[PDB]
Every structure is written in C-alpha cells, then in structure tokens.
Amino acid sequence: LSASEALARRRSVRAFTDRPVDRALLARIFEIAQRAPSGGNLQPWQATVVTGERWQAVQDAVAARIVMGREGFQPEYDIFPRGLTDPWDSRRFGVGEALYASLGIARDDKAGRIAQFQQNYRGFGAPVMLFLHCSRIMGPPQWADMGMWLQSVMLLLVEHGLASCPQECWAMYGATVRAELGLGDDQILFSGLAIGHADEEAPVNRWPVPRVGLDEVIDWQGF
Amino acid sequence: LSASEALARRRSVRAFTDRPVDRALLARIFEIAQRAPSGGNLQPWQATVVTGERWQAVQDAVAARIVMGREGFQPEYDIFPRGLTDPWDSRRFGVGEALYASLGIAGRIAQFQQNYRGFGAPVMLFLHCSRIMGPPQWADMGMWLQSVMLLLVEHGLASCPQECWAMYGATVRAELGLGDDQILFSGLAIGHADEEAPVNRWPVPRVGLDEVIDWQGF
Ligand SMILES: Cc1cc2nc3c(=O)[nH]c(=O)nc-3n(C[C@H](O)[C@H](O)[C@H](O)COP(=O)(O)O)c2cc1C
Ligand SMILES: Cc1cc2nc3c(=O)[nH]c(=O)nc-3n(C[C@H](O)[C@H](O)[C@H](O)COP(=O)(O)O)c2cc1C
User: Fold this and answer.
1) Which residues of chain A make contact with B43, given a CB cutoff of 8 A?
2) Which residue is closest in CA terms to ligand 1's atom 5?
3) Which DSSP category does A18 fall into?
4) How far is B199 from chain A (nearest CA, A)?
5) In the 8-state DSSP scheme, what is residue B89?
6) Which of A38, A83, A194, B75 is the most exposed place for a label (fewest CB within 10 A)?
7) Which stretch of DSSP H or E encloses residue B170?
C-alpha cells in the first residue's frame, strides 16, 4: 500500500471493532514514525499508550468530570481560537453535519447529537488510546513537529490495516488525564489518538469527507 | 513506493539539481496532501509556492536583511525554546555536527548562507496561516507538511523544511504580498535531490523508543 493510498485511505474512524491490537505491530509502527522530521531534530513528541484498565481508569476518571458539566472542564489550551472567524468556522460544522448525517441524528435533535459526541470519551470503543504530550517548554513550531509525527503514525496504521481517530477532546480535561497517567505539570497534553481495527461496515466510517479546493489553499508565483 | 518506505527515505535534502519540477505533479501532490486531518477540519494551512523570478525576488530581499547582521532579523516567533535544556539540545548538535562533518565546515556561515538559497532548489514553498491560529492548528500544519514531504519522496522529488525563513518572516511576507493577518511558519525547499552529493547521504540519527513511548495496561 502506497503513501498516496494510505493517505487517501486515512480518515478519522469513529467505530472500532472489539478486536485487540498487536503490541508488536505498534512498536514497529512507532520505530518508523520516529523517522518524522523535526526542527533541529529535537523530536519533541512524547507518547503514553494505554489499554485495558489503565485505559479504563482514564475513561472513568474523566467521566467523573464530565457529569460535572462545564464546571468540570480543565482545558490545557484553547482547542479552537476564541472568536474563530467565519471562513474556518464553516469547515468545522460542515463536517459535523456530514457525520451526524451518517448516524441518523436529526439536524437539531440536540439530545442525540450530544449522545454521539460523548462516545469521544470512550475512544469510540478503541482498545488502545494514545496520549501525545510534550514539555510545557515546547513552542508552536515544536507542536508542528508533533503533527508531523502524529500524521506519520496515522499513515502507518492504515498501511498495516489498522485505523485511528485523533482526539483533542481529552485536552478538555488535561489535568485529570495527566494525573491518571502520572505525568507531572512540566508536561502538557496535546491530543489523544484512539487506535484499533475499523468497523468498516459501520456507516459512521464511510460517508465521504469534504476538503476545500486547492484555490483556497495554494498560491502559485513565478510560473 | 509504500508509506513505510516513503518515511524511511524522506530526509532533509540540502543539495538539489537544476532539474525542473513538473507543476502538474506538484498540483496533484497538493490535492492529495489536502486529505491530511485537522482538528475540526479547519485545514488551517495556506501555501505560497514560488519558482522563477519571484523566487529570486524573495531571496534577494532576505539577503538584504542578512547583510544587516543582527539588525535585519524579523522573527515571526521563537524557533527554539528559550531555556531549552541541554538534554534536548544534545539531539541538535548530534545531528548538526554530523551534517557539518559531511561538508568539512568548522567558517560555518558559508553553509548557513546556503539556507537562504534554499540549497539550490528550483521551487520554494511557504507555509503560513492566520495569526489567530493556536498551537493545535500549528500541529495541523505539521500534519499537512509531513504529508507533502512523503508525497515528494514517493514521486521521486525531494525536500527540506526550513524554519530559517522565520528569521525574516516580515520581509518574506512582504515579497509574497501577504498581510500581517498572516504569520510565516516555515519554508519548504522542493526539488530533485543531487543524489550523489554527500550531504544527502549521511545517516541521520533518531533517539530510541524507550525515550519516546510509555506502555500502560499491557
Ligand atoms: C488534532 C486533531 C484533533 C482531533 N480531535 C477530534 C476529536 O476530539 N473528536 C473527533 O470526533 N474528531 C477529532 N478529530 C478528527 C477531525 O475532525 C478530522 O481530522 C477532520 O474532520 C477530517 O476528517 P477525516 O480525518 O476523517 O478525513 C481531530 C483531528 C485532529 C487533527
Ligand atoms: C519545521 C522544520 C524546520 C526545519 N528547518 C530547517 C532549516 O531551516 N534548515 C535546515 O537545515 N534544516 C531544517 N529542518 C531539518 C531538520 O534539521 C531535520 O528534519 C532533522 O534535523 C534531521 O532529520 P531528517 O534529515 O531526517 O529530516 C527543519 C525541519 C523541520 C521539521
């Protein structure tokens, strides 16, 4: 399977089968992901990988904050820019309507759409959850480094018949997550990555995902 | 060429041939690179791609900043973290001196000079975004950028990501015709690798996974 294909066939998967992931596969995937580039070869990404009931502990501990409502939020950072303007603001809800479409939840059936969202905190039923973090000394370019490593991981997964879903939602409770995991407050939680076998006849995993056209992305000069 | 192979054979290339780059190829590459993920599918990345005489225009303007010594610097942001501790810096010098070893330099600005020539690449990509975007969105840009770099390799092209242009983000933003609504993250030199230049063949170190991955619940 080519890089193009893996890239074409990577999507955020929101339905995993109850099927385990070979730790040997993961370790091998990470060895190659480490070939990701980084400014100054700093390689600032750090990963805690949890499964079973270390992973169940996290879910429960965070679930205990979720029922607190907005009161229980412990944001590591601003997931989206406050006052995100209307260009980007459309892309966010644009896919939202594409994906709730796939499950059957009415457009302003607010109850049901929230119900699908909290599945986030089950890692959509993935057996393994990856927590990507780094030192609080790292700046935005180093966060870009982490993207590069993260995207590598997702492509290798696809290549080896596995799937994933990137999740910033856990940053809503960074401290709780960091606590359960045992990282200190020198560390900052960036994102989670639910890892597992995609349920490829779950409809939540088959609706076509939109991207904007290149005219909104790419400027050409000197040609 | 598989994704594993593509990752394995992507390196920062610092010697490009004069071989021109098919714009049709680049365009196709970007179309599929756009499939990279982004929090909320913001796809916050934007790119200005230059070759020819606008690309020479950018270089000339930055060189004018270079001759200024420290005065000509216009940092978009801070490339490496103030008070980066020497544990992490150890990685930088490990690879840095391995790379200065291959060229013979130890005097070193001559090599650093070559940066702003894009190591002789015919095409230079400038990745930027709105000043409103936060660090998660910068991670998004990373995901797109790594996508682009893997595709170059798969298609027989090569690249070098360059934060050095951020040393003059403002001058560069001017040449590109960008506003101060935008901030420059990085450059990406694009072209065919001069594949028997030795600076393109020395083995690049990575740390072991025991410094990287913690396993729990297994
Ligand atoms: C950093 C990051 C965080 C994400 N967090 C979540 C998340 O918390 N919940 C979720 O459902 N999807 C999350 N996603 C998935 C994105 O919505 C998805 O990448 C985008 O809509 C494109 O869809 P696709 O990846 O399936 O092509 C995240 C993606 C990224 C890059
Ligand atoms: C965001 C970013 C910016 C970079 N900027 C430069 C640069 O300005 N000059 C340079 O020689 N290398 C630059 N690099 C190359 C890194 O030094 C390189 O990725 C790492 O040192 C060596 O790994 P590699 O050759 O396998 O890519 C950059 C890499 C990244 C990810």
Assistant:
1) 88, 91, 211-212, 217
2) A167
3) S
4) 16
5) H
6) A83
7) helix B169-176
| H or E stretch at A116 | helix A110-118
The structure tokens listed for B37 are 């993920």
Select from B86, B85, B74, B97 the least CA-distant residue to B171.
Answer: B74
Residues 25-54 of A with CB under 8 A from B: 27, 30-37, 39-54
Parallel, antiparallel or unpaired: strands A46-51 and A128-135:
antiparallel
In this structure, the number of other CB atoms found within 10 A of the CB of residue A28 comes to 15
Pull the structure tokens for residue A128.
């393994």
Give the resolution in Å.
Answer: 2.4
Q: Which two tokens stand for residue B30?
A: 């970007």
Q: What was the structure determination method?
A: X-ray
State the pairing for strand pair B213-216/A46-51.
parallel
Q: What is the DSSP string of A150-188?
A: HHHHHHHHHHTT-EEEEE-GGGGBHHHHHHHHT--TTEE
Alpha-carbon dihedral angle through residues A148, A149, A152, A156, given to the nearest 10 degrees: -170
Can you tell me which residue has the tokens 């870009």? A144
Encoded tokens for A186: 């020198």
Nearest CA to ligand 2 atom 19: A37
CA A182 – CA A54 distance, rounded (Å): 11
- Ligand 1 site-directed mutation target among A12, A88, A145, A211, most atoms within 8 Å of CB: A12
